[PDB]
């Protein structure tokens, strides 16, 4: 029952839909899209122990987007990863789904609203530590320009938060907030200042640093924008109010873009799994699981100056224009070099035009939050990262390569 989909548009459904589905099924449904294509997935019917997993890439390799069980259709997904997969599992117990997908083409400023106001961020992507006991201030009401109250926690303290799962690794460049006027009392509420916490997986968190305290609203009605000092790469966002007028109430928008919106900046398959485990290698290990080196996907990281290396075989010659480096799940690399090959035998370092020597790249400052490091494009099938300086705990790293088809 496993099938790959490549046509511009098509349908995906449980075997025998709409008849009741057979027992003891494990089906894999993979959509593959060419570079600079977005995959749009919409669910029409959903009725199911038993589950449907959606994967940002290859199942059990790429990150899990979500797991679904009941009678609620999964919210619409737009992926620019080049691959989006479903796994459908049933057992003997009493017993599906129908979906459709589309493949569409995708001054560019990285300042696009990510979808709080529009609803492109679905209700199921929004959550919070708590909500006000009358039920009129749910997390789902935290949408900019929303006409029905906003999010309010059950208690007003600086421990409460509103959480948004963007589902995919995204560039975050700005945050807008409003307070809200109660439709029941006409009392005004707003956040005066807040902190930002981010994460690639929803477990490992980093408080954004200058802790950066963002100045927020001074009334219940006007949008206040705070632009970040530099773009963050992340999936999960938490807004943590620190001070407020009368009480915590929040409506929100997030701004940014996708990694792939930059020229020749496609993730070449470490995170997703299109770069298979056999294409991944290293100077030394803790003997190994090649998947442990994958950006974000890995639940640990590669553990082995200027002697150790991690190596990625892209499969065919491509234009390489950068890497995404991540720490390990606590250690991380602070400084590194990069080399590349077209045959896997001979190597050349990425030069620094300024100093006319092999370039010494800045690594991470946290174990989870990744960093993009770009460089002048070169032709390469193989890439190596050489850690130079690192956290006191030692070398720990996850990686992705950025580029496009050669031209």
């Amino acid at each position, epitope marked *: 029952c496993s099938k790959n989909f490549t046509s511009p548009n098509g349908t995906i459904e449980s075997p025998g*839909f*709409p*008849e*009741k589905y057979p027992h003891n099924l494990d089906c894999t449904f993979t959509i593959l899209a060419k570079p600079k294509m977005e995959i749009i997935l*919409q*669910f*029409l*019917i*959903f*009725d199911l122990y038993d589950w449907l997993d959606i994967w940002d890439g290859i199942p059990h390799v790429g990150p899990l987007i979500g797991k679904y069980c009941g*009678t*609620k*259709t*999964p*919210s*619409e997904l737009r992926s620019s990863t080049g691959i989006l997969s479903l796994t459908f599992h049933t057992d003997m117990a009493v017993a599906g789904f*129908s979906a459709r997908y589309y493949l569409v083409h995708q001054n560019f400023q990285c300042n696009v609203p990510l*979808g709080m*106001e*529009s*609803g*492109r961020i*679905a*209700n199921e992507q929004i959550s919070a530590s708590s909500t006000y006991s009358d039920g009129r201030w749910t997390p*789902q*009401q935290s*949408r900019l*320009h*929303g*006409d*029905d109250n906003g999010w309010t926690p059950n208690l007003d303290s600086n421990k409460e938060y509103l959480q948004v799962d963007l589902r995919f690794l995204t560039m975050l460049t700005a945050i807008a907030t409003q307070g809200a006027i109660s439709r029941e009392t006409q009392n005004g509420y707003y956040v005066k200042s807040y902190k930002l916490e981010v994460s690639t997986n929803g477990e490992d968190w980093m408080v954004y640093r200058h802790h950066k305290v963002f100045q927020a609203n001074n009334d219940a009605t006007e949008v206040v924008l705070n632009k970040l000092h530099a773009p963050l790469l992340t999936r999960f966002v938490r807004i943590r109010p620190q001070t407020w007028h009368s009480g915590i109430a929040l409506r929100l928008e997030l701004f940014g873009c996708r990694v792939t919106d930059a020229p020749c900046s496609n993730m070449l398959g470490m995170l997703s799994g299109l770069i298979a485990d056999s294409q991944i290698s290293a100077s030394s290990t803790q003997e190994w699981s090649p998947s442990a080196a994958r950006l974000v996907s890995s639940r640990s990281g590669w553990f082995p100056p200027g002697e150790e290396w991690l190596q990625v075989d892209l499969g065919t010659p491509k234009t390489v224009k950068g890497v995404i480096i991540q720490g390990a799940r606590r250690a991380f690399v602070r400084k590194f070099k990069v080399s590349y090959s077209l045959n896997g035998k001979d190597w050349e370092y990425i030069q620094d035009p300024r100093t006319q020597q092999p370039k010494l790249f800045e690594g991470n400052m946290h174990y989870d939050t990744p960093d993009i490091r770009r460089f002048d494009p070169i032709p390469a099938q193989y890439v190596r990262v050489y850690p130079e300086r690192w956290s006191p705990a030692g070398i720990g790293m996850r990686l992705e390569v950025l580029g496009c088809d050669w031209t």
Partner: antibody, heavy 120, light 109 residues
């Protein structure tokens, strides 16, 4: 209380367009999608199209060439616009709530209907 | 397109009696079926969703049944206020929301 309040014209000249606004209250358009349906003696009840939470649309194949559904979340308004009406588009037009934000679900709350006559 | 056939245009009944309204889909639609009640000069009202689930607030005397192609709406004890046109519809596959032609009830008194 959940309400869908329709506003639109009673008379449309042949080959002109029909605009109807569906103003919703008691729920958010980011929580529930909205359908458009019409009812006539000759053709019964016909689905025209929908908009989901997030703004993605689906149209009946008979109407896709001349129908637009869009919305304004901040105003709780869904905009229906159909072009080039003719005599056989005479009907009562309805908006109706989708029982969920996405998916094909049952229409659980209905607007009051807008009677539209296509005539010179 | 899927066709939803209600062969009963009109049905005679009596206060207190059982009414069984049938609807036949031209292809299999699973349980993706709803029933609506429409009284004169009013908008339709949802009674039943997913073939057999009673919508919240709908009186107990309304029950839906069936799966695949054959669907039934049962009113277990007809009341005068149940005079209406009753419509089935499918939303299993595209184009969705094809409606039956309606079944109007008449009460003998």
């Amino acid at each position: 209380q959940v309400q869908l309040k329709q506003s639109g014209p009673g008379l449309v000249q042949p080959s002109q367009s029909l605009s109807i606004t569906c103003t919703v209250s008691g729920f958010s358009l980011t929580s529930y999608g909205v359908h458009w349906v019409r009812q006539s003696p000759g053709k019964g009840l016909e689905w025209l199209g929908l908009i989901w939470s997030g703004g993605s649309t689906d149209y009946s194949p008979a109407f896709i060439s001349r129908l637009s559904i869009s919305e304004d979340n901040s105003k709780s308004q869904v905009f229906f616009k159909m072009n080039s009406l003719q005599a056989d588009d005479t009907a009562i037009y309805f908006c109706a709530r989708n029982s969920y934000s996405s998916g094909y679900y049952a229409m659980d709350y209905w607007g009051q209907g807008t009677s539209v006559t296509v005539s010179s | 397109d899927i066709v939803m056939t209600q062969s009963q245009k009109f049905m005679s009944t009596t206060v207190g009696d059982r009414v069984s309204i049938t609807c036949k889909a031209s292809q299999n639609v699973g349980t993706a079926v709803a029933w609506y009640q429409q009284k004169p000069g009013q908008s339709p009202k949802l009674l039943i969703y997913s073939a057999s689930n009673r919508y919240t607030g709908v009186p107990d005397r309304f029950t839906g049944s069936g799966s695949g192609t054959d669907f039934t709406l049962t009113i277990s004890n007809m009341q005068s206020e149940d005079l209406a046109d009753y419509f089935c519809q499918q939303y299993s596959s595209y184009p969705p929301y094809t409606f039956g032609g309606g079944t109007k009830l008449e009460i003998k008194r």
